[PDB]
Write an enzyme that holds these catalytic residues in place. Structure first.
Site, PDB file in Angstrom:
ATOM      1  CG  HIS A  83      -0.497   0.103   2.544  1.00 44.85           C
ATOM      2  ND1 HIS A  83       0.025  -0.961   3.238  1.00 44.85           N
ATOM      3  CD2 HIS A  83      -0.488   1.143   3.402  1.00 44.85           C
ATOM      4  CE1 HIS A  83       0.391  -0.568   4.444  1.00 44.85           C
ATOM      5  NE2 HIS A  83       0.087   0.716   4.575  1.00 44.85           N
ATOM      6  CG  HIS A  85       0.384   4.229   4.876  1.00 43.14           C
ATOM      7  ND1 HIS A  85      -0.467   3.485   5.680  1.00 43.14           N
ATOM      8  CD2 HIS A  85      -0.289   5.339   4.504  1.00 43.14           C
ATOM      9  CE1 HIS A  85      -1.603   4.153   5.810  1.00 43.14           C
ATOM     10  NE2 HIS A  85      -1.532   5.291   5.083  1.00 43.14           N
ATOM     11  CG  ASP A  87       4.562   0.900   6.811  1.00 47.90           C
ATOM     12  OD1 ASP A  87       3.880   1.674   6.081  1.00 47.90           O
ATOM     13  OD2 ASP A  87       4.063   0.043   7.569  1.00 47.90           O
ATOM     14  CG  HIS A 148      -3.557  -0.368   7.241  1.00 46.92           C
ATOM     15  ND1 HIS A 148      -3.229   0.140   8.481  1.00 46.92           N
ATOM     16  CD2 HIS A 148      -2.660   0.124   6.361  1.00 46.92           C
ATOM     17  CE1 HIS A 148      -2.191   0.955   8.346  1.00 46.92           C
ATOM     18  NE2 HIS A 148      -1.805   0.953   7.044  1.00 46.92           N
ATOM     19  CG  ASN A 179      -2.074   5.679  10.635  1.00 44.51           C
ATOM     20  OD1 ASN A 179      -2.985   6.508  10.756  1.00 44.51           O
ATOM     21  ND2 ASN A 179      -1.347   5.592   9.530  1.00 44.51           N
TER      22      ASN A 179
HETATM   23  C1  LIG Z   1       6.481   7.914  10.946  1.00 44.03           C
HETATM   24  C2  LIG Z   1       5.381   7.104  11.585  1.00 44.03           C
HETATM   25  O1  LIG Z   1       5.796   6.057  12.394  1.00 44.03           O
HETATM   26  C3  LIG Z   1       4.683   5.412  12.913  1.00 44.03           C
HETATM   27  C4  LIG Z   1       4.966   4.240  13.807  1.00 44.03           C
HETATM   28  C5  LIG Z   1       3.456   6.060  12.402  1.00 44.03           C
HETATM   29  S1  LIG Z   1       1.890   5.626  12.737  1.00 44.03           S
HETATM   30  N1  LIG Z   1       1.117   5.288  11.368  1.00 44.03           N
HETATM   31  O2  LIG Z   1       1.864   4.471  13.599  1.00 44.03           O
HETATM   32  O3  LIG Z   1       1.211   6.717  13.395  1.00 44.03           O
HETATM   33  C6  LIG Z   1       3.900   7.168  11.540  1.00 44.03           C
HETATM   34  C7  LIG Z   1       3.071   8.150  10.800  1.00 44.03           C
HETATM   35  O4  LIG Z   1       3.483   8.620   9.623  1.00 44.03           O
HETATM   36  O5  LIG Z   1       2.019   8.532  11.289  1.00 44.03           O
HETATM   37  C1  LIG Z   2       2.803   0.693  13.390  1.00 40.65           C
HETATM   38  C2  LIG Z   2       2.676   1.440  12.091  1.00 40.65           C
HETATM   39  O1  LIG Z   2       3.703   2.293  11.759  1.00 40.65           O
HETATM   40  C3  LIG Z   2       3.454   2.889  10.519  1.00 40.65           C
HETATM   41  C4  LIG Z   2       4.426   3.883   9.954  1.00 40.65           C
HETATM   42  C5  LIG Z   2       2.189   2.366  10.018  1.00 40.65           C
HETATM   43  S1  LIG Z   2       1.427   2.776   8.602  1.00 40.65           S
HETATM   44  N1  LIG Z   2       1.455   1.592   7.487  1.00 40.65           N
HETATM   45  O2  LIG Z   2       0.030   2.993   8.919  1.00 40.65           O
HETATM   46  O3  LIG Z   2       2.067   3.929   8.019  1.00 40.65           O
HETATM   47  C6  LIG Z   2       1.674   1.435  11.023  1.00 40.65           C
HETATM   48  C7  LIG Z   2       0.507   0.570  10.905  1.00 40.65           C
HETATM   49  O4  LIG Z   2      -0.354   0.447  11.878  1.00 40.65           O
HETATM   50  O5  LIG Z   2       0.454  -0.151   9.864  1.00 40.65           O
HETATM   51 ZN   LIG Z   3      -0.082   1.629   6.361  1.00 41.72          ZN
HETATM   52 ZN   LIG Z   4       2.048  -0.362   8.503  1.00 40.36          ZN
END
Ligand SMILES: Cc1oc(C)c(S(N)(=O)=O)c1C(=O)O
Ligand SMILES: Cc1oc(C)c(S(N)(=O)=O)c1C(=O)O
Ligand SMILES: [Zn+2]
Ligand SMILES: [Zn+2]
Ligand SMILES: [Mg+2]
Ligand SMILES: [Mg+2]
Ligand SMILES: [Zn+2]
Length: 231
Positions: A83, A85, A87, A148, A179
């Protein structure tokens, strides 16, 4: 046995052999002063490798390619992002500069552009509608529906019965939603049931973040999503 945050120094990547010709890759980043792990997949494709997802950012993704060359020593020829995002696509520019062909659905490429994220080069056809599947070398790509994110894919390795759920599937130790800014909470359980229907034989289930398990992670994720829905 499976590595946690506490085993992975800053900017390092671990590889974990799940089955013959199937690894996960594990990396970490700090966010809001906590450290989070992130999983992707590597699948042997004859004498080449298919990568599923970046290692969450340019530095981690360079470290991923170095660790693959050290430990496996076969070329990463293609990468699929599951997807939009960071990661999943963060490090696509590193892959592309290294000669890796980068792929995502047109849904993913559009949402990455809107987010100002890195954008895989190639568009994957045949994944636009819930329940759609296509073979991509040694894997099946499956669009279960919005969960998600509206674009989330899952990846199945039929040779190994490995299901890569990505961020649509939560690890068992995750009890709260986190998130869900881009999530379809209304559709997420229906989308998880499509995964169960399509891959009932899966023996290994890998979440986007944290410890692998079995198909129990699907109903676990539905429980957490429904609890969040009723918050
Ligand atoms: C940089 C980053 O790290 C984490 C762990 C998250 S999140 N999707 O969990 O809020 C994010 C975000 O972009 O919100
Ligand atoms: C733990 C976490 O960190 C990041 C950066 C994300 S995501 N894929 O929503 O950006 C999530 C997620 O819940 O997938
Ligand atoms: Zn994501
Ligand atoms: Zn993720
Ligand atoms: Mg296979
Ligand atoms: Mg999780
Ligand atoms: Zn190309």
């Amino acid at each position: 046995e499976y590595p946690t945050v506490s085993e992975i120094p800053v900017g390092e990547v671990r590889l974990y052999q799940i089955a013959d010709g199937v690894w996960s890759h594990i990396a970490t980043q700090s966010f809001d002063g906590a450290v989070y792990p992130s999983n992707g997949l590597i699948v042997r494709d004859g004498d080449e490798l298919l990568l599923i997802d970046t290692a969450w950012g340019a530095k981690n993704t360079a470290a991923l390619l170095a660790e693959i060359e050290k430990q496996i020593g076969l070329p990463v020829t293609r990468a699929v992002s599951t997807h939009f995002h960071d990661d999943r696509v963060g490090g696509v520019d590193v892959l592309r500069a290294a000669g890796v062909a980068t792929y995502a659905s047109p849904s993913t490429r559009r949402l990455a552009e809107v987010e100002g994220n890195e954008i895989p080069t190639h568009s994957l056809e045949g994944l636009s509608s819930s329940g759609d599947a296509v073979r991509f070398g040694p894997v099946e790509l499956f669009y279960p529906g919005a969960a998600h994110s509206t674009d989330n894919l899952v990846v199945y390795v039929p040779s190994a019965s490995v299901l890569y759920g990505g961020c649509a599937i939560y690890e068992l130790s995750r009890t709260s939603a986190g998130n869900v800014a881009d999530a379809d909470l209304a559709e997420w359980p229906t989308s998880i049931e499509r995964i169960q229907q399509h891959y009932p034989e899966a023996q290994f289930v890998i979440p986007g973040h944290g410890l692998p398990g079995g198909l129990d992670l699907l109903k676990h994720t539905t429980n957490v999503v429904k609890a969040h829905t009723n918050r």
